[PDB]
Amino acid sequence: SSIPVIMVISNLLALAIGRYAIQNPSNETPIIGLNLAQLVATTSFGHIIGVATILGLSNMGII
Amino acid sequence: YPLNPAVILIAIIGWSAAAAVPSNIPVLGGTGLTQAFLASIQRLLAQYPTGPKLDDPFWFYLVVYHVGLFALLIFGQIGYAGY
Amino acid sequence: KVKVVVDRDVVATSFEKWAKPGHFSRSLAKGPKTTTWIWNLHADAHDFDSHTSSLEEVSRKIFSAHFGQLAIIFIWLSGMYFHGARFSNYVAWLSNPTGIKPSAQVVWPIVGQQILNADVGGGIQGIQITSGLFQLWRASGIVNELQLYVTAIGGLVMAGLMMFAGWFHYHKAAPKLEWFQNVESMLNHHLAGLLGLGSLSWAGHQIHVSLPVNKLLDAGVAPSSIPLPHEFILNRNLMAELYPSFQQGLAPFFTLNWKQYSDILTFKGGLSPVTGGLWLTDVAHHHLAIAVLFIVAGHMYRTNWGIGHSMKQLLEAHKGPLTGEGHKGLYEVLTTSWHANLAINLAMLGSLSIIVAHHMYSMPPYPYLATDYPTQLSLFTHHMWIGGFCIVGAGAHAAIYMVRDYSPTVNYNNVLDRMIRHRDAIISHLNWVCIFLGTHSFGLYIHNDTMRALGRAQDMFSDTAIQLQPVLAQWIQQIHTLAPGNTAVNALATASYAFGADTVTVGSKIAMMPIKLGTADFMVHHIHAFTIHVTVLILLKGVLFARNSRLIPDKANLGFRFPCDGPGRGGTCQVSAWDHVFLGLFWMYNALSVVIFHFSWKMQSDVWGTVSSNGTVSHITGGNFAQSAITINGWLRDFLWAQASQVIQSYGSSLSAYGLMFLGAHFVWAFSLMFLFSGRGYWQELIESIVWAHNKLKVAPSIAPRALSITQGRAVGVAHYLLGGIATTWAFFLARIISVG
Amino acid sequence: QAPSGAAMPSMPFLKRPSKLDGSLPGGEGCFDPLGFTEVFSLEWMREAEVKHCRVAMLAVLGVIAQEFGTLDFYHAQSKLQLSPDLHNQFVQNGALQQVLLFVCAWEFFVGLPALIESLEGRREPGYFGFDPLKLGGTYGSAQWKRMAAGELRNGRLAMIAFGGFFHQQLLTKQGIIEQLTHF
Amino acid sequence: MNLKKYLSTAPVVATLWLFLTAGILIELNRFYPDSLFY
Amino acid sequence: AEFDPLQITSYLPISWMRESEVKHGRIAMLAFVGTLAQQAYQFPWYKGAPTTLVGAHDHFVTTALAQILLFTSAFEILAGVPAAIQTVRGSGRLPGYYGFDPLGLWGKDEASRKRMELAEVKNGRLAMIAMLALWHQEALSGGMGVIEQLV
Ligand code: CLA
Ligand code: CLA
Ligand code: CLA
Ligand code: CLA
Ligand SMILES: CC1=C(C/C=C(\C)CCC[C@H](C)CCC[C@H](C)CCCC(C)C)C(=O)c2ccccc2C1=O
Ligand code: SF4
């Protein structure tokens, strides 16, 4: 149950980080305001952060 | 180079507080790095003439502290000088 | 921005130019009037940036030549697999790894050379091999000759494909300069695609083939009775018996329940007590962890989608107040000069070969490698030599960059310019450090020889007199011994038994054990520090003074490779960057000779040997390193004299080829001195008298005989010196270790 | 819809190979999807195809003929013609050693000169002008092209057929005629 | 004709001639081994 | 493109995408009537087969699907790859065109052809959606058939 929640947050944070982090964001996408290339880039970062955090808390017996 | 010796004041408190976090257990204690390092000098200056052996973990608490302190104070110089 | 752009049908496939020796050079195309032309043809054949001024045409030759190199490597590998399949005791060796000597070369019966077909076991007679191919193939899960044959055929098909691709990318579809200058793309692909997917796909082989085959081999199952690799993939129950995690399948990977793969992916450290090799579950996990790192790393650089770093922006950003314009220009340098890139790449690949040598002996990665002492000694020594040659090459290409490709405009107040502007400070300090290191390292041996000769053992630098304990190395050994469960909490055992903890034996033979460092080890380490600092002095001096000195203010105009600027200014022999490389080779030879001698003796004295039923370690040379390796006389007597016994007594045995090659290599070494000590002026004058005799008998050639160029004399000299010197050690080492190991 | 210019007859979606114009006897399809003819000599490839055709055709008929009946003095223990067992026997007999000699003789003294002539462009690939009975007619006629097209179509079929022969015999351990009769 | 010119180049003819020479000497020692005198 | 909110056409070329969509659709369309066929009728050769999207796949993986893979891969290597590469490089071929029309069902003029071209895609898309739904439904009904799904 905790795995999907952390992963969505990590993807949503990476998406929010991405709006400021990425050099020249799109702002031609209905709600997220990133192009597909940038969406894949941020979600990729959100996955790496998500997997690493999840494995961090699993190793510490928190989840 | 602005210098400002207050870089050394931040370098001590900045590293020491970060290094004073409680660790797991072995060859450290669980207290931290500083709490182990400041405990290691306390029981070594108690026997001021007779210095430490290679077996003693003081040498590890020394290197990992200083290699952390020198890192935090060098990156302290660049930050203050080059805003 | 990142695009494929090629020129089509750019060079016709014709034998025309094959029949025109030296077509590639305006100077050589006219053909020979003297024998100098014949040497020049060969010396210049691959100097592509001398043939043409077009960076595009140079780049295209390089890319195509690279395919030629891979084609040859594939023929060589194919050969090794085919010799394994057809002429080896590999299959028999799998059933008795400790008893049978690996052999994959059989000589024909002619002029009595069949004596070299040694009694190696496994129902063949042949040369004992030291390449470690059997240990590699066993780690890969190869159990039969069909698997080796198919790999050999596969190799020939890859060789063919490399040849086609080399031909194709030169003659049919040659990429444009802008293709090659895609360094960001190249690095993303090489990091994520070559290293990342290489390691991922290899980890795949290990988990699916190596792991199950080696687990059954290590349990003692007959290699013929082991299921073929595909049966582990097809039947999951077969795999689930060996590694229960395979019951849960790939569900634990996608759900991040990765601890479920604790059976197949481990952090055991240490070695198999069965094979004396690294646990393959450690290696599979290593390769998975590395693969991820590399695939992630290869997303760093901007290509076609905005995201990623500009290497230009990164370099130009790394600017501080002490280093002027910092790394400004270096992006232009490295995108416009092949030599600049070859300089870096040889330095790192060479340095890597040396790291590989150290890591592979101490953390023996292959099963039954550790206790195959011939293979351990051979692999360490080989990878040391390849590393040494590459590092000297880095010097050569760094200096070629400085002469041919360097511009002051590109390198204006950047780290390269600023280095040139204090070359006197750099070289004076390094010179000093070389004299400090040489006196205080080699001086300790001479002090010791003198004190021992004068009957003053209590005045020596030794473990029993004036001790020089390598306390920092000793302290680091302790930390690495205390690591497992402490600073490496999930590691069950040390990275290496070299640092401390247990003695690992396979049969009676020592695989690895703690390598204790004392006064002898402190002393030889300062010799290594010394020989490396001097080699750096020679090669770095070559680079920083490649273009000019106070002696030769226009040296760049004379070029990379030229003999001198004449006997004036007191004499200017060997001022060229090329001549620094020439001198660098001897010192590299000196440096690495002492490294492999240090290795051979230390391992024989203090590591390798037998452990009895009682459990007492008997080393090959019974711990003589500590008291003998602190004098030159001890090296001469207890190492060279004592250990040469095997190679010089080899006549009339299967090791007689080593005896012959030992003498042959001494001959070639000595022959080299004729070239190094003499000058072509003598030789050209001698040839004049010989030419007279031919003229007298109307048998003088139209291609006028010339003495070798001054530079070729040096090139021939150092090539025979290195061939002779290295091959001598090779024969010494192999005869010694195949006999006593 | 199709591609813009000339399309490959055999594969109407793929563009026609530059060298294959449909004029060759058994190459109306211009069948080269992987584009071998784009990089390799057509005269070489044609020589190879026609050589394989003629070797395969003799070999397919050889298997069938040897299955039906073998000579007495050739004590053939194996009834499987494309088995290692039979091949090995007639290497040791010296039968395949003898035909190797005259095949090697042909290839070195005839086949290699013939190939070099074709690469120079002074010989049509496969032409040895061998027609004693004149079942082709005059060299270059519509009758010759029909037989030339027939040779390849018969040869290509035998080439593939020999694959079926070898592989089926390797699984079943039965004769090609024995397999047809018994399931 | 250009391939034949290449095969007539010093190193190719030297390689082939010394191969042939080595073959003759090797084959003579295979069939007449240990010839210390005529 | 009409409906492309992510703007995938901006990154991969429409010719390549429209090859993929039409390829997917044709596979999905045979797969949908294939699933209804196998769940209804069984061949005499197999007899004792699961007749479930997951079970039938797992059953026929070593034999039937291995042969399908071999001859499906063959087509993709020889026809599918050069077709897909020639379209993007600019041959002028419509994506999906393999010249397969033994009958005259495409139509005449352009209007009737583009309607039949649109028909293929929209029949492909509905079969594409269908095949995703059938896997979800079979998974979360304890391995229930597509006809057995209707109580
Ligand atoms: C198959 C036939 C073929 C033919 C007819 C040609 C023809 C040509 N090539 Mg091409 N080429 C080919 C294949 C071919 N190439 C292949 C397979 C490659 C990939 C390696 C190339 C890559 C290539 C490059 C990079 C270049 C050419 C060039 C040329 C031209 C000059 C070649 C020359 O003088 O070489 C004669 C040289 C040799 C016969 C030596 C070849 C050495 C081989 C590769 C390695 C030998 C192995 C090993 C080191 C041997 C050690 C033995 C031991 C005794 C020490 C000529 C038009 C050059 C040019 O300038 O064109 C304008 C040029 O720069 N070719
Ligand atoms: C995934 C992408 C990829 C991979 C795997 C490689 C791999 C390689 N490149 Mg690089 N390259 C790439 C992308 C890639 N490149 C791109 C995009 C560019 C332009 C920016 C370049 C530009 C470039 C140049 C200019 C040069 C290279 C060279 C090399 C070789 C370096 C020597 C070596 O390590 O041999 C390792 C050898 C092997 C692993 C065996 C051969 C592997 C072959 C080529 C196939 C590998 C990929 C293939 C998809 C595998 C299929 C797997 C199969 C199970 C289906 C190596 C084969 C050098 C070279 O030697 O060229 C000939 C070289 O000079 N590359
Ligand atoms: C045994 C052979 C030998 C020896 C002793 C030397 C010595 C030296 N070489 Mg040379 N070299 C050699 C072979 C040798 N080389 C060969 C064969 C080549 C051709 C490839 C070269 C080419 C070469 C190059 C290109 C360079 C060197 C350099 C050096 C110097 C290195 C720095 C140093 O350690 O100085 C200290 C001296 C020693 C280590 C020698 C003995 C020291 C003794 C044991 C201690 C002092 C004794 C005391 C003062 C004696 C008093 C007695 C008296 C009162 C009677 C050193 C002087 C480099 C250099 O100059 O570095 C700065 C340098 O760049 N050499
Ligand atoms: C065995 C050797 C062989 C060779 C050298 C050729 C050569 C040729 N063929 Mg022929 N062909 C062959 C067998 C061969 N063919 C067979 C068995 C058939 C029946 C299917 C055909 C049917 C055919 C047609 C209809 C046509 C040709 C044509 C040609 C010519 C142009 C195409 C080309 O370059 O092919 C080069 C071929 C090769 C180099 C051999 C294939 C090599 C691959 C790598 C083998 C393995 C591929 C793969 C694993 C196969 C299975 C995959 C999957 C389907 C299971 C060329 C002279 C064209 C022509 O112009 O005729 C005059 C033409 O229209 N071929
Ligand atoms: C010995 C020596 C020579 C003399 C060596 C020469 C000229 C090289 C000898 C050439 C060898 C023998 C090869 C020539 C062989 C021919 C190609 C013929 C081959 C015949 C068959 C084997 C095919 C120098 O010219 C020289 C120059 C500068 C510094 C030192 C020296 C030096 O030490
Ligand atoms: S001795 Fe030789 S290298 Fe030295 S100056 Fe004279 S010619 Fe030049």
PDB file of C-alpha atoms in Angstrom, chain F:
ATOM      1  CA  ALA F   1      -2.344  14.846 -35.725  1.00  0.00           C
ATOM      2  CA  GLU F   2      -5.932  15.671 -34.502  1.00  0.00           C
ATOM      3  CA  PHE F   3      -5.761  14.053 -30.977  1.00  0.00           C
ATOM      4  CA  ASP F   4      -2.099  14.215 -29.736  1.00  0.00           C
ATOM      5  CA  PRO F   5      -2.088  16.075 -26.355  1.00  0.00           C
ATOM      6  CA  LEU F   6       1.325  14.579 -25.235  1.00  0.00           C
ATOM      7  CA  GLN F   7       2.683  15.624 -28.735  1.00  0.00           C
ATOM      8  CA  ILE F   8       4.423  12.213 -29.367  1.00  0.00           C
ATOM      9  CA  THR F   9       4.351  13.072 -33.163  1.00  0.00           C
ATOM     10  CA  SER F  10       6.741  16.006 -32.248  1.00  0.00           C
ATOM     11  CA  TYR F  11       9.390  13.403 -31.077  1.00  0.00           C
ATOM     12  CA  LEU F  12       8.782  10.263 -33.252  1.00  0.00           C
ATOM     13  CA  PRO F  13       7.637  10.810 -36.897  1.00  0.00           C
ATOM     14  CA  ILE F  14       3.858  10.280 -37.663  1.00  0.00           C
ATOM     15  CA  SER F  15       4.754   7.795 -40.523  1.00  0.00           C
ATOM     16  CA  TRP F  16       6.528   5.557 -37.904  1.00  0.00           C
ATOM     17  CA  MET F  17       3.718   6.038 -35.275  1.00  0.00           C
ATOM     18  CA  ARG F  18       0.965   5.300 -37.898  1.00  0.00           C
ATOM     19  CA  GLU F  19       2.932   2.115 -38.887  1.00  0.00           C
ATOM     20  CA  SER F  20       2.906   1.071 -35.143  1.00  0.00           C
ATOM     21  CA  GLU F  21      -0.831   1.945 -34.573  1.00  0.00           C
ATOM     22  CA  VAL F  22      -1.954   0.044 -37.767  1.00  0.00           C
ATOM     23  CA  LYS F  23       0.470  -2.869 -36.907  1.00  0.00           C
ATOM     24  CA  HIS F  24      -0.880  -3.019 -33.274  1.00  0.00           C
ATOM     25  CA  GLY F  25      -4.524  -2.753 -34.556  1.00  0.00           C
ATOM     26  CA  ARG F  26      -4.174  -5.681 -37.052  1.00  0.00           C
ATOM     27  CA  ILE F  27      -2.527  -7.850 -34.290  1.00  0.00           C
ATOM     28  CA  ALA F  28      -5.268  -6.765 -31.769  1.00  0.00           C
ATOM     29  CA  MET F  29      -8.070  -7.475 -34.352  1.00  0.00           C
ATOM     30  CA  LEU F  30      -6.827 -11.076 -35.086  1.00  0.00           C
ATOM     31  CA  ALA F  31      -6.204 -11.503 -31.282  1.00  0.00           C
ATOM     32  CA  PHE F  32      -9.846 -10.537 -30.346  1.00  0.00           C
ATOM     33  CA  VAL F  33     -11.573 -12.932 -32.868  1.00  0.00           C
ATOM     34  CA  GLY F  34      -8.720 -15.427 -32.097  1.00  0.00           C
ATOM     35  CA  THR F  35      -9.654 -15.432 -28.336  1.00  0.00           C
ATOM     36  CA  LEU F  36     -13.430 -15.857 -29.138  1.00  0.00           C
ATOM     37  CA  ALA F  37     -12.530 -18.670 -31.662  1.00  0.00           C
ATOM     38  CA  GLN F  38     -10.206 -20.725 -29.328  1.00  0.00           C
ATOM     39  CA  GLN F  39     -12.606 -20.348 -26.296  1.00  0.00           C
ATOM     40  CA  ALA F  40     -15.535 -21.529 -28.558  1.00  0.00           C
ATOM     41  CA  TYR F  41     -13.882 -24.257 -30.769  1.00  0.00           C
ATOM     42  CA  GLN F  42     -10.768 -26.491 -30.189  1.00  0.00           C
ATOM     43  CA  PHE F  43      -8.734 -28.263 -32.978  1.00  0.00           C
ATOM     44  CA  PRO F  44      -8.490 -32.119 -32.819  1.00  0.00           C
ATOM     45  CA  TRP F  45      -4.605 -31.960 -32.634  1.00  0.00           C
ATOM     46  CA  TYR F  46      -4.417 -30.271 -29.146  1.00  0.00           C
ATOM     47  CA  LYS F  47      -7.742 -31.418 -27.490  1.00  0.00           C
ATOM     48  CA  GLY F  48      -6.667 -30.814 -23.815  1.00  0.00           C
ATOM     49  CA  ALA F  49      -5.671 -27.084 -23.944  1.00  0.00           C
ATOM     50  CA  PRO F  50      -6.552 -24.490 -21.208  1.00  0.00           C
ATOM     51  CA  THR F  51      -8.393 -22.034 -23.617  1.00  0.00           C
ATOM     52  CA  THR F  52      -7.508 -19.010 -21.345  1.00  0.00           C
ATOM     53  CA  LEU F  53      -5.426 -15.946 -22.532  1.00  0.00           C
ATOM     54  CA  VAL F  54      -2.792 -16.628 -19.751  1.00  0.00           C
ATOM     55  CA  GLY F  55      -3.063 -20.485 -19.628  1.00  0.00           C
ATOM     56  CA  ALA F  56      -3.220 -21.042 -23.452  1.00  0.00           C
ATOM     57  CA  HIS F  57      -0.137 -18.725 -23.884  1.00  0.00           C
ATOM     58  CA  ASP F  58       1.852 -20.585 -21.129  1.00  0.00           C
ATOM     59  CA  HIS F  59       0.733 -23.982 -22.651  1.00  0.00           C
ATOM     60  CA  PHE F  60       1.724 -23.178 -26.315  1.00  0.00           C
ATOM     61  CA  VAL F  61       4.915 -21.130 -25.431  1.00  0.00           C
ATOM     62  CA  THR F  62       7.484 -23.950 -26.187  1.00  0.00           C
ATOM     63  CA  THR F  63       5.692 -25.230 -29.392  1.00  0.00           C
ATOM     64  CA  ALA F  64       2.954 -23.233 -31.278  1.00  0.00           C
ATOM     65  CA  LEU F  65       3.929 -19.654 -30.146  1.00  0.00           C
ATOM     66  CA  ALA F  66       7.677 -20.534 -30.664  1.00  0.00           C
ATOM     67  CA  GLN F  67       6.820 -21.433 -34.335  1.00  0.00           C
ATOM     68  CA  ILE F  68       4.510 -18.328 -34.651  1.00  0.00           C
ATOM     69  CA  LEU F  69       7.424 -16.216 -33.185  1.00  0.00           C
ATOM     70  CA  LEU F  70       9.891 -17.760 -35.758  1.00  0.00           C
ATOM     71  CA  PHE F  71       7.727 -17.011 -38.897  1.00  0.00           C
ATOM     72  CA  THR F  72       6.298 -13.703 -37.443  1.00  0.00           C
ATOM     73  CA  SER F  73       9.942 -12.594 -36.686  1.00  0.00           C
ATOM     74  CA  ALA F  74      10.941 -13.762 -40.241  1.00  0.00           C
ATOM     75  CA  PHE F  75       8.290 -11.424 -41.829  1.00  0.00           C
ATOM     76  CA  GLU F  76       9.359  -8.499 -39.524  1.00  0.00           C
ATOM     77  CA  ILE F  77      13.109  -9.025 -40.408  1.00  0.00           C
ATOM     78  CA  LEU F  78      12.530  -9.347 -44.228  1.00  0.00           C
ATOM     79  CA  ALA F  79       9.377  -7.161 -44.828  1.00  0.00           C
ATOM     80  CA  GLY F  80       8.535  -5.284 -41.559  1.00  0.00           C
ATOM     81  CA  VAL F  81      12.050  -3.781 -40.950  1.00  0.00           C
ATOM     82  CA  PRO F  82      12.901  -2.528 -44.519  1.00  0.00           C
ATOM     83  CA  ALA F  83       9.240  -1.285 -44.877  1.00  0.00           C
ATOM     84  CA  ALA F  84       9.389   0.713 -41.562  1.00  0.00           C
ATOM     85  CA  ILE F  85      12.951   2.070 -42.334  1.00  0.00           C
ATOM     86  CA  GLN F  86      12.008   3.080 -45.967  1.00  0.00           C
ATOM     87  CA  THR F  87       8.817   4.998 -44.820  1.00  0.00           C
ATOM     88  CA  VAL F  88      10.688   7.283 -42.294  1.00  0.00           C
ATOM     89  CA  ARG F  89      13.684   7.813 -44.713  1.00  0.00           C
ATOM     90  CA  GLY F  90      11.033   8.912 -47.311  1.00  0.00           C
ATOM     91  CA  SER F  91      10.131   6.131 -49.836  1.00  0.00           C
ATOM     92  CA  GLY F  92       6.568   7.575 -50.276  1.00  0.00           C
ATOM     93  CA  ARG F  93       4.874   4.346 -48.977  1.00  0.00           C
ATOM     94  CA  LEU F  94       1.701   4.747 -46.810  1.00  0.00           C
ATOM     95  CA  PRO F  95       2.283   3.218 -43.317  1.00  0.00           C
ATOM     96  CA  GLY F  96       0.436  -0.171 -43.230  1.00  0.00           C
ATOM     97  CA  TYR F  97       0.635  -0.733 -47.056  1.00  0.00           C
ATOM     98  CA  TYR F  98       2.147  -4.231 -47.707  1.00  0.00           C
ATOM     99  CA  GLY F  99       0.237  -4.386 -51.077  1.00  0.00           C
ATOM    100  CA  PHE F 100      -2.067  -7.143 -49.623  1.00  0.00           C
ATOM    101  CA  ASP F 101      -5.396  -6.855 -51.555  1.00  0.00           C
ATOM    102  CA  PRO F 102      -6.146 -10.105 -53.495  1.00  0.00           C
ATOM    103  CA  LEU F 103      -9.821  -8.877 -53.721  1.00  0.00           C
ATOM    104  CA  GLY F 104     -11.013  -5.294 -54.610  1.00  0.00           C
ATOM    105  CA  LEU F 105     -12.374  -4.357 -51.121  1.00  0.00           C
ATOM    106  CA  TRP F 106     -10.229  -1.144 -50.612  1.00  0.00           C
ATOM    107  CA  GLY F 107     -12.410   0.838 -53.109  1.00  0.00           C
ATOM    108  CA  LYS F 108     -11.960   3.394 -55.971  1.00  0.00           C
ATOM    109  CA  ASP F 109     -11.071   7.171 -56.104  1.00  0.00           C
ATOM    110  CA  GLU F 110      -9.621   8.500 -52.731  1.00  0.00           C
ATOM    111  CA  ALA F 111     -12.718   9.246 -50.493  1.00  0.00           C
ATOM    112  CA  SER F 112     -13.741   5.499 -50.342  1.00  0.00           C
ATOM    113  CA  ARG F 113     -10.052   4.393 -49.824  1.00  0.00           C
ATOM    114  CA  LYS F 114      -9.348   6.886 -46.929  1.00  0.00           C
ATOM    115  CA  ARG F 115     -12.729   5.844 -45.317  1.00  0.00           C
ATOM    116  CA  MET F 116     -11.565   2.150 -45.565  1.00  0.00           C
ATOM    117  CA  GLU F 117      -8.081   3.310 -44.300  1.00  0.00           C
ATOM    118  CA  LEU F 118      -9.772   5.179 -41.350  1.00  0.00           C
ATOM    119  CA  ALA F 119     -12.117   2.127 -40.853  1.00  0.00           C
ATOM    120  CA  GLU F 120      -9.056  -0.214 -40.413  1.00  0.00           C
ATOM    121  CA  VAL F 121      -7.475   2.122 -37.756  1.00  0.00           C
ATOM    122  CA  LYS F 122     -10.755   2.742 -35.778  1.00  0.00           C
ATOM    123  CA  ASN F 123     -11.527  -1.060 -35.964  1.00  0.00           C
ATOM    124  CA  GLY F 124      -7.860  -1.557 -34.844  1.00  0.00           C
ATOM    125  CA  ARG F 125      -8.217   0.936 -31.902  1.00  0.00           C
ATOM    126  CA  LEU F 126     -11.505  -0.688 -30.643  1.00  0.00           C
ATOM    127  CA  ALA F 127      -9.893  -4.203 -30.876  1.00  0.00           C
ATOM    128  CA  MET F 128      -6.753  -2.664 -29.178  1.00  0.00           C
ATOM    129  CA  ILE F 129      -8.934  -1.334 -26.239  1.00  0.00           C
ATOM    130  CA  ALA F 130     -10.914  -4.666 -26.242  1.00  0.00           C
ATOM    131  CA  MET F 131      -7.751  -6.868 -25.862  1.00  0.00           C
ATOM    132  CA  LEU F 132      -6.571  -4.772 -22.808  1.00  0.00           C
ATOM    133  CA  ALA F 133     -10.085  -5.167 -21.212  1.00  0.00           C
ATOM    134  CA  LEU F 134     -10.263  -8.994 -21.861  1.00  0.00           C
ATOM    135  CA  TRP F 135      -6.927  -9.560 -19.954  1.00  0.00           C
ATOM    136  CA  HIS F 136      -8.096  -7.378 -16.962  1.00  0.00           C
ATOM    137  CA  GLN F 137     -11.540  -9.161 -16.915  1.00  0.00           C
ATOM    138  CA  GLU F 138     -10.052 -12.742 -17.176  1.00  0.00           C
ATOM    139  CA  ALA F 139      -7.444 -11.879 -14.434  1.00  0.00           C
ATOM    140  CA  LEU F 140     -10.102 -10.468 -11.976  1.00  0.00           C
ATOM    141  CA  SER F 141     -12.811 -13.185 -12.569  1.00  0.00           C
ATOM    142  CA  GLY F 142     -10.742 -16.263 -11.418  1.00  0.00           C
ATOM    143  CA  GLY F 143      -9.867 -17.207 -15.055  1.00  0.00           C
ATOM    144  CA  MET F 144     -13.412 -16.752 -16.532  1.00  0.00           C
ATOM    145  CA  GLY F 145     -14.012 -17.059 -20.340  1.00  0.00           C
ATOM    146  CA  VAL F 146     -15.031 -13.980 -22.457  1.00  0.00           C
ATOM    147  CA  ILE F 147     -18.512 -15.578 -23.156  1.00  0.00           C
ATOM    148  CA  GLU F 148     -18.613 -17.094 -19.575  1.00  0.00           C
ATOM    149  CA  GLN F 149     -18.036 -13.472 -18.259  1.00  0.00           C
ATOM    150  CA  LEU F 150     -21.762 -12.755 -19.106  1.00  0.00           C
ATOM    151  CA  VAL F 151     -22.952 -14.687 -15.939  1.00  0.00           C
TER     152      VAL F 151
END
